[PDB]
Amino acid sequence: EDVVIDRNLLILGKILGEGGSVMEGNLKQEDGTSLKVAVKTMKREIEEFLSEAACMKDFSHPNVIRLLGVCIEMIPKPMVILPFMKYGDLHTYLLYSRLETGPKHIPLQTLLKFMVDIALGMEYLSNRNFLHRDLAARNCMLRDDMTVCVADFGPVKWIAIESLADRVYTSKSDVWAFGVTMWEIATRGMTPYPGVQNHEMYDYLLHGHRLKQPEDCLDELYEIMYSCWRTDPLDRPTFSVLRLQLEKLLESL
Ligand SMILES: NC(=O)Nc1cc(-c2cccc(F)c2)sc1C(=O)N[C@H]1CCCNC1
Ligand SMILES: [Cl-]
Numbered sequence: 001e002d003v004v005i006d007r008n009l010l011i012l013g014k015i016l017g018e019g020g021s022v023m024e025g026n027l028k029q030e031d032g033t034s035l036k037v038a039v040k041t042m043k044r045e046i047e048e049f050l051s052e053a054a055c056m057k058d059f060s061h062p063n064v065i066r067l068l069g070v071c072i073e074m075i076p077k078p079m080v081i082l083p084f085m086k087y088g089d090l091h092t093y094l095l096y097s098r099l100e101t102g103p104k105h106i107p108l109q110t111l112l113k114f115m116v117d118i119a120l121g122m123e124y125l126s127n128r129n130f131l132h133r134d135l136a137a138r139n140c141m142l143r144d145d146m147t148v149c150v151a152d153f154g155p156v157k158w159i160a161i162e163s164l165a166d167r168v169y170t171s172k173s174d175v176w177a178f179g180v181t182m183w184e185i186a187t188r189g190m191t192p193y194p195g196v197q198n199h200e201m202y203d204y205l206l207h208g209h210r211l212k213q214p215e216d217c218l219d220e221l222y223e224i225m226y227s228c229w230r231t232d233p234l235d236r237p238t239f240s241v242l243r244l245q246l247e248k249l250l251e252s253l
């Protein structure tokens with residue numbers, strides 16, 4: 001396909017993360033310049049892979065990570081090629097922000113803009129009937145301009161009650177993972193459901209218990225993230241409704 005990149009245009013560097021592993025890289029480009037890339041390994045069957053990557057490579061949105069292509073080193077081991085992001089994942093960034101060494105205290109207006117950015121990304125993927133299935137702040141990347149894009153597309157405390165039960169997954173389960181992500185950002189990196197263990201989570205949710213309003217968090221913001229966890233998927237808003245709720249709340253500060 002036009003998605004496959006020659007292994008010779010790619011030089012692999014140091015390991016950055018674990019998701020097999022994700023590496024630093026140089027991509028040699030059509031214009032003779034080299035581009036900083038992240039290279040992530042993957043766990044025939046590769047035809048369905050290449051075909052999915054070919055599909056994702058057509059994505060174009062500031063708040064979705066570009067898939068620049070795929071390499072196959074040879075047993076074939078394929079590798080997803082992505083623009084390198086020195087600011088790393090959101091979750092780590094939030095934790096670092098609570099240290100004096102790390103980034104400055106993040107004001108709420110900036111925390112809401114992270115949420116708007118993810119909403120915009122998920123709005124765009126949702127429209128093309130693409131399901132993420134692993135939305136969480138650890139899988140949102142920060143670009144050099146500090147804009148957030150959604151990533152690592154294709155964790156029980158992010159799985160929506162209907163997906164825990166029936167092994168069903170719709171865009172509305174993605175909306176559930178989005179509210180948990182909104183909570184991770186409002187809490188600046190707390191694990192969801194403190195004092196509840198992974199095995200207790202289905203029964204905790206089944207008895208109607210939800211993520212608790214964070215201490216900083218605005219009531220209006222907590223109403224938006226609470227709407228993402230309504231029992232019936234059909235009663236949850238769409239990403240397009242959510243994006244505009246958040247855009248409108250951000251406008252009023
Ligand atoms: N694209 C890019 O630069 N990637 C990328 C870059 C990372 C990174 C960038 C600068 C410093 C550093 F320590 C890590 S980490 C990472 C990545 O893809 N992490 C994944 C691990 C699996 C779960 N979600 C985050
Ligand atoms: Cl290499």
Ligand SMILES: [Cl-]
Nearest residue numbers: 086087093096
């Ligand atoms: Cl950083």
Ligand SMILES: [Cl-]
Nearest residue numbers: 209210211212
């Ligand atoms: Cl509750």
Ligand SMILES: [Cl-]
Nearest residue numbers: 193194211212
């Ligand atoms: Cl909680």
Ligand SMILES: [Cl-]
Nearest residue numbers: 211212213214
């Ligand atoms: Cl509460």
